[PDB]
């Protein structure tokens, strides 16, 4: 019956709904008693009466029992915003983009703009500028923003340059540049005996905080290390073992880029890195 198979069909949906894996064959799997035309007509009206729903994915089609708040919600909407919203909530986590959703729904910017503004007021979808380039402004359900990702911008440099300090101190004792051989004094007795790095302790060190920050994965920590490798700030030995290049003297023919100052005035007999090209 419309109400009977409606409420008991919404019962198997509200209990499980065969999770998200429900196909229409799963209807007969649990309740096959209704005639083929009856169970189809009642799915039809219960979508028309928005007491159940459909999802277009993979093989066959998914179905679910309505939350009835989503029912009233999308029913207040326009005709497109049924397919627009519910189509976008199907985009879920990754959302969906503008001109790509037009080709899917066969519409135009303007007519797709109006629903974007409507749910904008609704705040059940949200403006999404993701980690990829902001050519998108993709929109997912305002309630949830899981996405692939620290952050693209700065104040990672701050934490790098500071952890490089602690790691340099971890190599031999601190600067001790008070005199020439002052540094490292043969690194205790035979630095061969000292085989060391953190690669682990870093987050234990990161406990210091003192900045806007969160935890971080040891993998990305190792990426921080990879930079300083590339930077030639530290050294890679035996995988996770690392030894700073002691550029600290750099920090402070005969070859260094520091301790250097140009003439760069008047006399035209000089050297450039172009002047030939």
């Amino acid at each position: 019956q419309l109400s009977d198979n409606a409420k008991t069909l919404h019962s198997q949906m509200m209990s499980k709904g065969i999770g998200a894996l429900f196909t229409q064959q799963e209807l007969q799997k649990q309740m096959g008693i209704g005639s083929l035309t009856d169970l189809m007509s009642i799915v039809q009206e219960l979508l028309d009466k928005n007491l159940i729903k459909l999802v277009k994915q993979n093989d066959e089609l998914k179905f679910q029992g309505v939350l009835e708040s989503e029912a009233q919600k999308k029913a207040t909407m326009s005709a497109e915003e049924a397919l627009v919203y519910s189509y976008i909530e199907a985009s879920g986590r990754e959302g969906i983009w503008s001109k790509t959703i037009k080709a899917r729904t066969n519409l135009h910017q303007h007519v797709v703009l109006k629903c974007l503004k409507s749910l904008e007021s609704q705040r059940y979808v949200k403006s999404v500028k993701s980690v990829k380039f902001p050519t998108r402004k993709i929109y997912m359900l305002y309630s949830l923003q899981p996405s692939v990702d620290e952050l693209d911008i700065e104040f990672i440099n701050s934490l790098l340059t500071i952890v490089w300090r602690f790691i340099s101190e971890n190599t031999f004792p601190n600067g001790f540049k008070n005199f020439e051989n002052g540094p490292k004094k043969n690194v205790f007795y035979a630095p061969n005996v000292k085989n060391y790095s953190t690669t682990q302790e870093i987050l234990e060190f990161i406990t210091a905080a003192q900045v806007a920050n969160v935890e971080l994965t040891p993998s990305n920590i190792r990426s921080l290390c990879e930079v300083l490798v590339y930077d030639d700030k530290l050294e890679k030995v035996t995988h996770d073992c690392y030894r700073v290049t002691l550029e600290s003297i750099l920090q402070m023919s005969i070859f260094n880029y520091f301790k250097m100052f140009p003439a760069s005035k008047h006399d035209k007999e000089v050297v450039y890195f172009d002047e030939w090209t």
């Binding site: 705040r123 949200k126 305002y142 309630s143 923003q145």
Partner: protein
Amino acid sequence: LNEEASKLKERIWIGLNADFLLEQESKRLKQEADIA
């Protein structure tokens, strides 16, 4: 005007305008939605 004119009269003016000030406060509530 006397105080009851302010109350009841104002009670009417807000009688209509509680939707104006309403959606006002609804935007003010969206200022919370600034979070998400």
